A paper describes a structure:
The two recently opened beamlines for macromolecular crystallography at NSLS-II have launched the microcrystallography field into new territory, with flux densities up to two orders of magnitude brighter than those previously available. In this study, we highlight the capabilities of the AMX and FMX beamlines at NSLS-II by describing structure determination from single crystal vector data collection and two methods for multicrystal data collection. The advent of next generation synchrotron beamlines has necessitated the development of new strategies to fully benefit from the increased beam intensity and smaller beam sizes while minimizing radiation damage. The high dose rates, in conjunction with the newly developed ultrafast raster scanning goniometer brings formerly time-consuming serial crystallography measurements into the minutes range. These new opportunities mean that inhomogeneous large crystals can now deliver high quality data collected from their best volume, and crystals as small as 5 to 10 µm can deliver one or more complete datasets.
B. cereus CDP-Chase is a member of the Nudix hydrolase superfamily, which are a family of enzymes that hydrolyze nucleoside diphosphates linked to some other moiety, x. It is a bifunctional enzyme that can hydrolyze CDP-choline with the typical nudix reaction in addition to a non-nudix exonuclease reaction on RNA. Here, we have described the determination of two CDP-Chase structures cocrystallized with ADP-ribose. For the sake of comparison between the single and multicrystal data collection methods, we collected data of CDP-Chase on both a single crystal and using the raster data collection. A total of 119 partial datasets were collected and processed using the Python scripted workflow described previously relying on DOZOR, XDS, POINTLESS, and AIMLESS. The dataset was refined to a final resolution of 2.0 Å using iterative rounds of refinement with REFMAC5 and manual rebuilding in Coot. As might be expected, the Rmerge is much higher in the multicrystal dataset compared with the single crystal (35.7% compared with 13.6%). Since Rmerge fails to take into account higher redundancy, both the Rpim and CC1/2 were considered and found to be reasonable (13.7% and 94.1%, respectively), emphasizing the need to look at multiple measures to assess data quality, particularly in the case of datasets derived from multiple crystals. The level of detail observed in both electron density maps is comparable, and the RMSD between the refined structures is 0.11 Å. Despite the less favorable statistics for the multicrystal dataset in both the collection and refinement stages, the similarities of the two structures highlight the reliability and applicability of this method when larger crystals are not available, even for ligand or small molecule bound structures.
Numbering used by the authors:
A (entry chain A): 2 to 205
B (entry chain B): 2 to 133, 142 to 205
The structure:
Amino acid sequence: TIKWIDWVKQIQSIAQAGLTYSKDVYDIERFQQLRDISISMMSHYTKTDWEVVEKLFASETGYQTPKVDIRAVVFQNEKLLFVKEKSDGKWALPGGWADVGYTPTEVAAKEVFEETGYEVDHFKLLAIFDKEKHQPSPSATHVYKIFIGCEIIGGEKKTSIETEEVEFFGENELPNLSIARNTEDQIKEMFAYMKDPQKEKLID
Amino acid sequence: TIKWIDWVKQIQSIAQAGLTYSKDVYDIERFQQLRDISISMMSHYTKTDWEVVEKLFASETGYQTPKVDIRAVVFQNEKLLFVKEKSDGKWALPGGWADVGYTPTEVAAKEVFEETGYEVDHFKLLAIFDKETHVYKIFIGCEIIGGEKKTSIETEEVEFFGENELPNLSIARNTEDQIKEMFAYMKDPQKEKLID
Ligand SMILES: O=C[C@H](O)[C@H](O)[C@H](O)CO
């Protein structure tokens, strides 16, 4: 019901597109002004520093698309693999932002290895969720979350500075979820796939 | 003070000047998009200020990821919907960059409607390609439920094409192997969905 956030996100996106593709020197200056207005609006109405907002909201290059998050979906004995971050104390599927220069499966494999110690392969395309569709909170950013099924083929469980705990959980014993990293409804869809792996793939 | 009102009027005034003076069709489209949004903003919050959202950037880091391109995969009795591109006069599936504010399926529906005039539904996730600007290319299947064929200033031609009568492909928009894979899915339903 906070309508203004999404208008301002659309204004920045169009200003970014203009700064990328316009060859008209007065129009390029128009798009910069518009981008700078989007930062001023966000800065004021979030009480966030102007230059911090510029970095977080308005420093991308090229046409603006949603950002990509990857979530690795690994089962053992009908229990789903979760990792707990030391700092926030909350639990999620292994994954994170898609690093530029990596394919979606290369991100899944790297994130699982760094967060859990496990080697994985045998990738399956499970789902794409739109983070903003029924999102609890307003978002400055738009995210698509790709869920990739993987098989453990090696390594061994290893914790780290960032990851305090690596554990499997059944559908009826879920730990305290980082809703920012995975929703309860996304976890339910992954247990549905585990029960019926030939089921249609969820795409928002 | 209510600061949003003066900022939106600045946006409106810049967009109006852009609209008047631009000769480039894509700049005119951008300024029209900005005009449209400015109209929508002024028709709400008649008296109220905007809600302050002090936690909006709490867990934001400015992390950049690959860009998303979407291609809509639309079959009509074993022929695939292609579009002749203004930019090169070569052919591609309807699609383009996924826009902020749109789900993957809304993107596929939007691009199909604007490029061809067809309404589509019954979306299926077919594939995500990336042969390593960095781009993840999402292929979404859907079916015509409505509308009718319509050429444009950007889309000179709309044409269905079989696997042995494929036009000159716009290779950046869709590779030969990507098109082949799509025919494979139509012919062998529940073939393993590719993810790079
Ligand atoms: O790529 C898609 C963009 O809409 C066009 O390339 C821009 O309008 C720039 O001309």
